[PDB]
């Protein structure tokens, strides 16, 4: 369960942080979650915390 970052779609540097078992599923996820700057839901994506 390596840990990953989920950078927002819009311009803001707001992100979420979670973990993902890299070994079983290699591809990235596109979860739609809330954004505290634009005050509405957008979709997120990334990995690679550093």
């Amino acid at each position: 369960r390596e840990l990953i970052r989920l950078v927002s779609s819009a311009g803001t540097g707001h992100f979420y942080t979670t973990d993902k078992n890299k070994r079983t599923k290699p591809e990235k996820i596109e979860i739609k979650k809330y954004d505290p700057v634009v005050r509405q839901h957008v979709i997120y994506k990334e990995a690679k915390i550093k």
């Binding site: 840990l3 942080t17 979670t18 973990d19």
Partner: protein, 63 residues
């Protein structure tokens, strides 16, 4: 003035007219575990407990 305060407790304890403020602990460097209910309830700036007052007010040279 022959009464030197400690330098550490003057940097963790600001003094207001309703006690001594201090920041909460445990919030650094492993944070992807904890549930928000626990993150937003450690974000404020509390005031100090009564058992701890007369311990710190000797470290800070108030006595």
């Amino acid at each position: 003035p022959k009464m030197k305060t400690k330098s550490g407790a003057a940097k963790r304890f600001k003094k207001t007219a309703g006690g001594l403020k201090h920041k909460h602990a445990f919030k650094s460097h492993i944070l992807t575990k904890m549930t928000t209910k626990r993150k937003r309830q450690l974000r404020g700036t509390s005031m100090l407990n009564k058992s701890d007052v007369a311990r710190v007010e000797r470290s800070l040279r108030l006595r």
